[PDB]
Design a protein around this nucleic acid. Sequence first.
DNA 1: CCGACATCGCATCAGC
DNA 2: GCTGATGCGA
DNA 3: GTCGG
Length: 326
Amino acid sequence: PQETLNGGITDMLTELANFEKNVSQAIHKYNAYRKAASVIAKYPHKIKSGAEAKKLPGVGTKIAEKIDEFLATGKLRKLEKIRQDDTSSSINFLTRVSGIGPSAARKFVDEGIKTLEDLRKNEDKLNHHQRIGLKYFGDFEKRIPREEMLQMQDIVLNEVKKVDSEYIATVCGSFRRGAESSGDMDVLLTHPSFTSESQPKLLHQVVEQLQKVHFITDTLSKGETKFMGVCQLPSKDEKEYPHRRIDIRLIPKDQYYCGVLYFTGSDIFNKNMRAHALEKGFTINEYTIRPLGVTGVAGEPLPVDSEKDIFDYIQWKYREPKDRSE
DNA sequence: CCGACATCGCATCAGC
DNA sequence: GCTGATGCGA
DNA sequence: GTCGG
Ligand SMILES: Nc1ccn([C@H]2C[C@H](O)[C@@H](COP(=O)(O)NP(=O)(O)OP(=O)(O)O)O2)c(=O)n1
Ligand SMILES: [Mn+2]
Ligand SMILES: [Mn+2]
Ligand code: NA
Ligand code: NA
């Protein structure tokens, strides 16, 4: 649908979502507003009343009431007031820095630290992750053209197999869903000598190699199965590429497809699949799917030899990654 | 009137 | 020293 | 905030 049909309303709900998330520290209200904004974005009519939007799943009394005020007056006083509030705005803005959540943002603002310049004046008071998020603040909010994502994929696929021929690196996330641009790169790593039943430094060597060739530039978090960090394409003396976020995850190779499914997403989709499963007598996570039982006590896990397998167990139509936006 | 809305890895904090 | 809780994030 | 127990 043309976004201007109910663009005023979806914007309003999205702002409210971000504020509940970053300032009120209520993730479920953030999700509620998101859900209401999303479903309205699909509505192929121009909303005339709150009671009309009330019909859509995820729109209840409070939001329908807020829509009525917006249509009848062109704004939302609560949203107008929040926007002029120095404290709420600062807290909200600071959470745009990677590593800074609602708790840290609130405490920063409480001690007068409110801008990026304030943060730069106070490196002492930031932890390692936050410093990096601050350093590449602009870059991390840049979107990554798919062409560059392909360039980034080449490097990873190359260096991965260079360490050991039987690794299997799989770019998931928005990229796998075929998006024209991505927020970051998500790499899913698997190796034969690592199973659920089950060679140790399996993730570490790959990361080390990507640092070796100067592809990985910074580390946010690193462990046995999880990597969170920063990368950069090498420049062709023509100008330099932005620093990008990259997540790497080493997963039980015999659970490869539940992982590919989870880390391909989307965000709402993974959520809808798990919630559906429950209404239908199943429970999925990133590793297993397992039929809860009669009583709803999980039974044993199943074999899965392709993504479609999981789609079959609860039997939705196998939707291509491109289709899993919700 | 009121609880679910998923769960996890890693960094760091609170405390023994 | 350690375990467990919290924060932030995927 | 919304849905549904
Ligand atoms: N809260 C979250 C966060 C991430 N995820 C999963 C699904 C996402 O596809 C995946 C990766 O996170 P992600 O990189 O943040 N999003 P995703 O790659 O979809 O989109 P982008 O912003 O990168 O473009 O992990 C999730 O299921 N629930
Ligand atoms: Mn991503
Ligand atoms: Mn990611
Ligand atoms: Na409704
Ligand atoms: Na943040």
